[PDB]
Amino acid sequence: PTYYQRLRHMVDDKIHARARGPMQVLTRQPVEGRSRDGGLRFGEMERDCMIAHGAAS
Amino acid sequence: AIPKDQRATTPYMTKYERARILGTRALQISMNAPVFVDLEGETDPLRIAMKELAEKKIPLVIRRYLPDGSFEDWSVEELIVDL
Amino acid sequence: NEVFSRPEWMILTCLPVPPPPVRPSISFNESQRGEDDLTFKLADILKANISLETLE
RNA sequence: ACAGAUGUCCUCGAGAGGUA
DNA sequence: CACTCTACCGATAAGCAGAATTACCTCTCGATCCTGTG
């Protein structure tokens, strides 16, 4: 036997998926946060990795 | 300007060129466009594009731009596909 | 530049105002309306200009 | 002569606590 | 031949300005008065 604890992080509270959700007002870009049905952020690292991959389209 | 047929690039097809022609042909076949090969029971546009490229039956022209601004046109059928 | 950027154009004599899309108004809470900081600053500039014109 | 209501998303700057 | 400041650049020494990994989750607050009025 070994003592084990259950942490507060569960997959049911972290799974997200968006497809043409709510829009913003100023920048007209997807909103922030999972609770607001937001979208994932494409950072500069992802951009330069895709540049290195050569996928311009 | 176009370098006549005293071209000096490579007589083979690069990976980026292969991807671009495959994507363009896949999109064209996905839309209602003529196919110049025997589908032979294939229904995915990308696979139809590869089948067309197998015997160089794609009527596409590659325009390779020199850094100065000149460009030479290379036909798909005359480009060796070794990759 | 002779046509694109002259030295005498470096002094601001006419100030364009951004359109409402540039500085939109937030929803605030229920039955509450607020304005962006750009709108308040533009109103302050207009008030200062009017005061200067009247004082002159 | 005529003519009484609806259109879907609102915060925003911050602060704190954490996950890789 | 060095007498006095005149014109030149070569060091030294303090003041500014920027900028600091990426992505994600949750809560919690604040968006205004009073001297001056009829």
Side-chain angles (χ1 to χ4, degrees), chain C:
Chain C
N1 195 271
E2 144 157 40
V3 53
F4 282 129
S5 89
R6 278 168 102 96
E8 75 247 9
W9 297 343
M10 267 172 133
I11 322 289
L12 287 171
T13 72
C14 205
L15 194 78
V17 278
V22 171
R23 29 152 194 84
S25 58
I26 41 59
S27 95
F28 219 103
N29 58 69
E30 213 288 294
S31 183
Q32 235 279 355
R33 188 52 69 243
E35 313 305 309
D36 205 311
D37 302 2
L38 276 202
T39 293
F40 287 147
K41 178 66 64 174
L42 274 176
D44 177 11
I45 286 185
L46 254 179
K47 279 149 56 177
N49 203 33
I50 286 191
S51 147
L52 172 69
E53 203 281 321
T54 55
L55 189 134
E56 187 270 317

Side-chain angles (χ1 to χ4, degrees), chain A residues 1-25:
Chain A
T2 316
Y3 203 63
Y4 263 76
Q5 328 155 280
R6 182 179 194 203
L7 301 192
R8 61 190 311 178
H9 311 285
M10 322 198 200
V11 64
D12 248 17
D13 308 329
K14 285 141 139 277
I15 166 174
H16 189 39
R18 190 218 212 241
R20 285 209 261 94
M23 270 327 329
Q24 221 161 349
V25 174

Side-chain angles (χ1 to χ4, degrees), chain B residues 47-65:
Chain B
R47 319 209 47 61
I48 298 184
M50 331 219 297
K51 190 150 190 303
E52 286 209 272
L53 195 61
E55 59 280 43
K56 330 294 298 323
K57 280 234 167 277
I58 305 195
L60 287 211
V61 171
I62 283 282
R63 176 169 285 191
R64 301 172 162 171
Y65 280 112

